[PDB]
Design a protein around this nucleic acid. Structure first.
Ligand SMILES: Nc1nc2c(ncn2[C@@H]2O[C@H](COP(=O)(O)OP(=O)(O)NP(=O)(O)O)[C@@H](O)[C@H]2O)c(=O)[nH]1
Ligand SMILES: [Mg+2]
Ligand SMILES: [Mg+2]
Ligand SMILES: [Mg+2]
Ligand SMILES: [Mg+2]
Ligand SMILES: [Mg+2]
Ligand SMILES: [Mg+2]
Ligand SMILES: [Mg+2]
Ligand SMILES: [Mg+2]
Ligand SMILES: [Mg+2]
Ligand SMILES: [Mg+2]
Ligand SMILES: [Mg+2]
Ligand SMILES: [Mg+2]
Ligand SMILES: [Mg+2]
Ligand SMILES: [Mg+2]
Ligand SMILES: [Mg+2]
Ligand SMILES: [Zn+2]
Lengths: 115, 95, 311, 37
RNA sequence: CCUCGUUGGAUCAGGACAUCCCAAUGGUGUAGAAGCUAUUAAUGGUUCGUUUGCAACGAUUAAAGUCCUACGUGAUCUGAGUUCAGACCGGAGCAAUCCAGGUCGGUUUCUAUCUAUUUACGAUUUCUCCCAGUACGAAAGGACAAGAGAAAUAGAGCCACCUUACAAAUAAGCGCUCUCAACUUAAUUUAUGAAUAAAAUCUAAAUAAAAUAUAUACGUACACCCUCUAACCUAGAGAAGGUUA
RNA sequence: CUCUUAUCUUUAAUCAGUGAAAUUGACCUUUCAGUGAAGAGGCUGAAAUAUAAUAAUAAGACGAGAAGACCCUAUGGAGCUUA
């Protein structure tokens, strides 16, 4: 459950998410009518003095049975047009992104591993 | 998915037309039991992808194609060059 | 070293705390009893940060621009700058240092000369001259008052002076400054701007200490400082802090200085398996100290406006 | 329909009627002329 | 004559309509889509932060309405001011002191006597899809209505799972489930038709209809008639209530 | 804090013993609109209405207490300073 001011991990190969500038990116906004962000929910990110959109692909909060609970809050950086900023994702991504309402096919194309 | 399809297009106008054309044909061509398909990426000007049940087609302009190189990722499952460049880390104390 | 510093979405400096608002209109009322107005601005940013509001609100009376903090700047250009100022409309200007009380004698003769040419109307018969000092915070407005007070009245410090922006809060009562001309100075809180024009204009002011580094980011300010310091060729930060060949990456240079100062933090890093607290070199403390040495002047004489607005 | 304090005919074809407790001028040629009291 | 004359927040809200959003319409310099303007309607809703004396700013939203209720509301709470005993600066005074000038510090308590009040309802909005990239339009662009699925919030419940506890047989949400009908009516639009010789006219003429938000005609729930030594209870402060091979 | 929850103790509540305080013109002590001093349980006009306890809430009774606050008055004081 990502909220405002939560520290999140950029699970991507994009330059902005690299370990330099150790300060973790923090959530500024959750694009939901509730402010709670779950898997598949977009958020606005404070990263390296920039404001960038990100998509939640994993979090530590328990979900419904038969679904993966991760050890970190993961996100992928998204361009304003909606194209992913990074070109590869190596960490496992839950398969539930496929069905839920939204535009997630672009991200799934980038990720080899699904869990 | 069972199949993965990538298609280049000259301009954003061309990408929209073919995406609409295929969607129109899909609804016309049976799919009575199968549900409808959303068109993704209309906000973007260079990459459109439609996720049919058994097939996913990603349409993009030339320049976008080389940048992402989707074909290499799915052809070489885990031996992709960009995926290989990424590395794992551990974090002990500085001193 | 990187040719161009990129922003592409960095926020501009945001300001106007309440005290700058309730004070801003108390200045306007005081214009009734004021015979002249002094603009104080740091001599490293002759054109960047000047608050547009002052000219519009109070432009009728005679005007002199004071460029304080001239010592910790490179004024080789001067002449070209002075010509540029005249084109803008800045008829009267002179560089001042308040810690060393340099060129602070020339102000009073010039200030009196301007009042002569002008008119006084309601106050025409008064022999007591009152004038106002205004500017962006942390430019030495309060210092100028004390420095004049001791160069003419020879009594000392009358306005509290501090090393942080926003020490003087409100337009206070009159303070005696001179005796023979008998000029009186009114002290006003620093007022920065509602809008800072370009974000670079806001960086240039952050480096000068006008902006409280905590609402712009110490790290971002540090990167701009390194970016400007390398372009100007003033590689004086590689001797104060041993950096060998020098560098263009802020993370690398901040690493070395943190090592030189033996500073460490326990920082929560976010990894795949969870959260772990790891001892780390103090990048933030390094940035704060690195900016301080620049502000003291030991990192070299810098004129920020040299590149964009050479004129 | 503009509701006006005083209603005035605006053209030849304008005509006047008493509908639902109020006076109306209705014009077939120009709907702009429709008015209510 | 130079000067200078209580209100924030929290909690819970009651009400007005001069309507911000949701709904029904007229007009257009309304092709479509965006807009502008008017009428009717008070239905439920009307966010989270940064700066902190409020005034701008950031990100959202269907929308972030305008007001009344002695700042609506301190015998519910809390900040600043009113504003003092200490102390400093700047100015005034020979001084004591002073300033509708700065700043730092700074203790109002209340056990409820009375009125009043403390046990049910029939849901709102957004997004995607379909219609359909169709109608319209030279293109650009780009919809109605009808239909389907998702969420959010609100209300009402619940414990198979998950989660946090009692390292108790339970309670909770961060978990799960359920939410609906409109007799009758306003702006407005049609049909028949006189006053008014018409192949006129929607009618504060006789008439037939359609058409917001409301609501209770209409339904759900409740009903039973009362053993009680005592014990036990998923019922409970007491009392009441339920159970007893 | 979002956003609150569980458990234990104190208190609470029932039983037994002991037993204060401020307060109190009298009261058989209602709602709405009007009137009126910004004002009404008690007046005017409508309305509502078997009688009494127990436990809770704090809108009202300009709720109850203090040597509080502000201003004005007295040919009332007192401390302080002087020219
Ligand atoms: N090197 C140098 N430092 C100076 C000079 N004048 C002032 N400073 C420094 O600036 C600070 C004082 O600034 P100050 O007079 O308070 O400026 P201000 O604008 O009146 N303050 P504010 O922001 O509150 O309005 C001190 O750190 C002082 O040493 C100068 O001429 N040279
Ligand atoms: Mg209300
Ligand atoms: Mg109305
Ligand atoms: Mg009260
Ligand atoms: Mg203290
Ligand atoms: Mg009480
Ligand atoms: Mg439609
Ligand atoms: Mg007893
Ligand atoms: Mg009685
Ligand atoms: Mg009675
Ligand atoms: Mg009354
Ligand atoms: Mg009575
Ligand atoms: Mg009681
Ligand atoms: Mg009360
Ligand atoms: Mg009282
Ligand atoms: Mg007398
Ligand atoms: Zn007409």
């Amino acid at each position: 459950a990502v909220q405002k001011m939560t520290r999140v991990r950029v699970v991507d190969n994009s330059a902005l998410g690299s370990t330099p500038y150790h300060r973790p990116p923090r959530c500024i906004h959750v694009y939901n009518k509730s402010g709670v962000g779950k898997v598949g929910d977009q958020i606005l990110l404070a990263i390296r003095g920039q404001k960038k959109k990100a998509l939640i692909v994993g979090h530590r909060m328990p979900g419904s049975r038969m679904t993966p609970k991760f050890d970190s809050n993961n996100v992928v950086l998204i361009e304003d047009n909606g194209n992913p900023v990074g070109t590869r994702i190596k960490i496992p991504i839950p398969t539930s992104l496929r069905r839920r309402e939204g535009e997630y096919s672009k991200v799934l194309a980038i990720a080899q591993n699904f869990v | 998915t069972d199949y993965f399809v990538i298609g280049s297009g000259t301009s954003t106008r061309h990408l929209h037309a073919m995406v609409h054309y295929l969607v129109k044909m899909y609804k016309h061509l049976k799919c009575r039991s199968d549900p409808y398909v959303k068109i993704e990426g209309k906000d973007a000007d260079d990459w459109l992808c439609v996720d049919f049940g058994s097939m996913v087609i990603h349409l993009m302009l030339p320049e976008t194609r080389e940048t992402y190189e989707l074909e290499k990722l799915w052809t070489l499952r885990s031996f992709d060059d960009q995926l290989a460049q990424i590395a794992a880390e551990t974090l002990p104390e500085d001193f | 070293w990187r040719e161009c510093f990129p922003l592409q979405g960095h926020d501009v400096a945001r300001w106007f705390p309440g005290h700058m608002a309730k004070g801003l209109k108390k200045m306007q009322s005081s214009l009734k009893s004021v015979d002249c107005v002094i603009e104080v601005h740091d001599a490293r940013i002759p054109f960047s940060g000047r608050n547009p509001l002052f000219q519009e609100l109070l432009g009728l009376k005679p005007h002199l621009l004071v460029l304080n903090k001239m010592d910790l700047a490179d004024l080789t250009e001067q002449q070209k700058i002075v010509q540029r100022l005249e084109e803008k409309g800045l008829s009267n200007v002179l560089f001042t240092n308040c810690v060393k009380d340099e060129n602070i004698k020339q102000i009073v003769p010039k200030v009196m000369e301007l009042i002569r040419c002008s008119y006084r109307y309601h106050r025409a018969e008064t022999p007591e001259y009152c004038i106002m000092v205004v500017g962006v915070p942390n430019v030495g407005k309060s210092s100028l008052i004390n420095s004049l007070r001791r160069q003419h009245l020879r009594t000392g410090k009358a306005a509290r002076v501090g090393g942080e922006p926003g020490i003087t809060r409100a337009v206070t009562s009159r303070i005696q400054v001179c005796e023979r001309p008998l000029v009186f100075l009114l002290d006003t809180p620093g007022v920065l701007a509602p809008r800072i024009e370009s974000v670079e204009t806001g960086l240039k002011l952050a480096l000068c200490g006008t902006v409280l580094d905590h609402l712009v980011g110490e790290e971002t300010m540090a990167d701009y400082l390194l970016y400007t310091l390398n372009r100007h060729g003033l590689f004086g930060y590689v001797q104060h802090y041993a950096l060998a060949s020098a560098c263009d990456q802020i993370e690398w240079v901040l690493k070395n200085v943190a090592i030189k100062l033996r500073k460490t933090r326990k920082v929560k890093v976010l990894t795949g398996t969870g959260n772990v607290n790891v001892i780390q070199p103090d990048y933030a403390m390094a940035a704060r100290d690195f900016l301080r040495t620049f502000r003291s002047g030991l990192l070299g004489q810098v004129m920020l406006d040299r590149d964009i607005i050479p004129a | 329909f503009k509701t006006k304090g005083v209603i005035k005919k605006r053209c030849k074809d304008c005509y006047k009627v008493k509908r639902r407790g109020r006076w109306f001028i209705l014009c077939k040629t120009n709907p702009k002329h429709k008015q209510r009291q």
